Amino acid sequence: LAEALHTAL
Numbered sequence: 001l002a003e004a005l006h007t008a009l
């Protein structure tokens with residue numbers, strides 16, 4: 001989750 005979101009941001 002965390003890194004999925006960071007990447008997308």
Ligand SMILES: [Co+2]
Nearest residue numbers: 002003006007
């Ligand atoms: Co990150």
